[PDB]
Amino acid sequence: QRYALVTGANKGIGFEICRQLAEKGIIVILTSRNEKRGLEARQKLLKELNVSENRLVFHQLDVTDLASVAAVAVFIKSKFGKLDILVNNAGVSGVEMVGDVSVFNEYIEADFKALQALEAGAKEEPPFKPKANGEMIEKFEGAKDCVVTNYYGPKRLTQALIPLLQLSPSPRIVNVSSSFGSLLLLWNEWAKGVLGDEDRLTEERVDEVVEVFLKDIKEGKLEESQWPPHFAAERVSKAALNAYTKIAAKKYPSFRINAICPGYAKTDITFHAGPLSVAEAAQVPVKLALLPDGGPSGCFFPRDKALALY
Numbered sequence: 647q648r649y650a651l652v653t654g655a656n657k658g659i660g661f662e663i664c665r666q667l668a669e670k671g672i673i674v675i676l677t678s679r680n681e682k683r684g685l686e687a688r689q690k691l692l693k694e695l696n697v698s699e700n701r702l703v704f705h706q707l708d709v710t711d712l713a714s715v716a717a718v719a720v721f722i723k724s725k726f727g728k729l730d731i732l733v734n735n736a737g738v739s740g741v742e743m744v745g746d747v748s749v750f751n752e753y754i755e756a757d758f759k760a761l762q763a764l765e766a767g768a769k770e771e772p773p774f775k776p777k778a779n780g781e782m783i784e785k786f787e788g789a790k791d792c793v794v795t796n797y798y799g800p801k802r803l804t805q806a807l808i809p810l811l812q813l814s815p816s817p818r819i820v821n822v823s824s825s826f827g828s829l830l831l832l833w834n835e836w837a838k839g840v841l842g843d844e845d846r847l848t849e850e851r852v853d854e855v856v857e858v859f860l861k862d863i864k865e866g867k868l869e870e871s872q873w874p875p876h877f878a879a880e881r882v883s884k885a886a887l888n889a890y891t892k893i894a895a896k897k898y899p900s901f902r903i904n905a906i907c908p909g910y911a912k913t914d915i916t917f918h919a920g921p922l923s924v925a926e927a928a929q930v931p932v933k934l935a936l937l938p939d940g941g942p943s944g945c946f947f948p949r950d951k952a953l954a955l956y
C-alpha cells in the first residue's frame with residue numbers, strides 16, 4: 647500500500663487533500679492539533695467517502711510541539727512501517743483582524759496585483775491601505791506563531807519522518823506554500839540575497855533570516871529594518887519554507903520535495919473568500935504528491951504550473 651500523512655487536515659484545504667488522496671486508494675493519516683476536531687473530521691470524511699474504515703486513520707499532530715511530532719513518527723513506524731507521502735499543509739496567517747474582516751481580502755487582492763507587476767519588471771510594491779472599516783494587526787506573538795507553524799513545522803516534521811520516507815519506493819514531500827513567499831515581495835535586501843543564493847543555502851542561514859525578522863517585529867523595527875509593510879510574517883515564513891524545500895531536495899535526492907501555491911481559495915484563513923473552492927485548491931498539492939519518479943524536485947510551483955506538470 648501507499649501511506650500519506652497530511653497536517654492541518656481537520657478543515658480547509660487539508661481536509662480535501664485527504665479526500666482526494668483517499669479516492670486514489672492511498673491510505674491517509676488525517677492529522678489535527680485538536681483531537682476532538684480531528685476525530686470528527688475523520689468521521690465526516692469517512693462518511694462522505696463511503697469507504698472502509700481502514701482507508702482513513704486519525705492521529706493528533708501539532709506541528710509546533712516537538713513531542714507531538716515525535717509521537718506521530720513512532721505511530722507510523724508501529725502501524726505501517728514506512729511513509730510514502732508527507733503533505734505539510736498546516737498554516738496560520740500571523741494576522742488578527744479588527745473591524746471589518748473583509749479588509750483581509752483587500753490586502754490579498756492588492757498583493758496579487760503587486761506580485762503581477764513585480765513579475766512583469768516593476769521595481770517596487772505599491773503602497774496600500776484598505777477601503778473598508780477594518781485593519782490587519784500584526785504583532786510579535788502572531789508572527790512567532792506564524793514562523794513556528796509555517797516554517798519550523800514543515801522542517802521539523804520533514805526531519806522526523808526521513809527514516810520512514812526513506813523506506814518508500816517513491817518518497818514525496820509537498821509543502822503548501824504561497825505565491826506571497828516570492829522574494830520579489832520580501833523587501834529585505836539581505837534576506838532576499840540569502841534566500842536567493844541557492845548554492846550557499848543551508849538550514850542555518852534560513853533560520854538566521856527568520857530569527858532576525860522575529861527580533862525586529864518584537865522590537866518594532868519592521869519598517870526601519872526593511873521587512874514587508876503587511877503580511878510580514880506570512881511572507882517571511884513562506885519564503886523560508888520555499889528555501890527549505892530547496893535545501894531538503896538537495897539533501898534527499900531520491901525524494902521529490904516541492905512547494906506549491908494552491909491558489910486563492912475559500913477557507914477559514916480567507917474568511918471564505920477567493921475564487922477557488924477547497925476541492926479546486928487541493929488539486930495542486932495532490933498533483934505534486936503523485937508526481938512520477940524523475941519529476942522536478944526542489945521547486946516552487948504556482949497553481950497553473952503545478953497542474954500542467956503532467
Ligand SMILES: NC(=O)c1ccc[n+]([C@@H]2O[C@H](COP(=O)([O-])OP(=O)(O)OC[C@H]3O[C@@H](n4cnc5c(N)ncnc54)[C@H](OP(=O)(O)O)[C@@H]3O)[C@@H](O)[C@H]2O)c1
Pocket residue numbers: 653654655656657658659660678679680683707708709710735736737738795822823824825907908909910911912913914915916920
Ligand atoms: N486558502 C488560501 O487561499 C490559501 C492560499 C495560499 C496558501 N494557503 C495555505 O494553505 C494551507 C491550508 O490553509 P487553509 O486555507 O486550508 O486554511 P484553514 O482552513 O485555516 O486550515 C488551516 C489548518 O491548519 C491547521 N493548523 C494551524 N496551526 C496548526 C498547528 N500548530 N498544528 C497543526 N495544524 C495546525 C488548522 O487547525 P485548527 O483547526 O486547529 O486551527 C487547520 O486544520 C496553509 O498553509 C495556508 O498558508 C491557503
Ligand SMILES: C=C(C)[C@H]1CCC(C)=CC1=O
Pocket residue numbers: 738739754823824825826827877880884909910911915916
Ligand atoms: C495568510 C495568507 C495571505 C495566506 C493564505 C491566503 C493566500 C491567498 C495566500 C497566503 O499566503
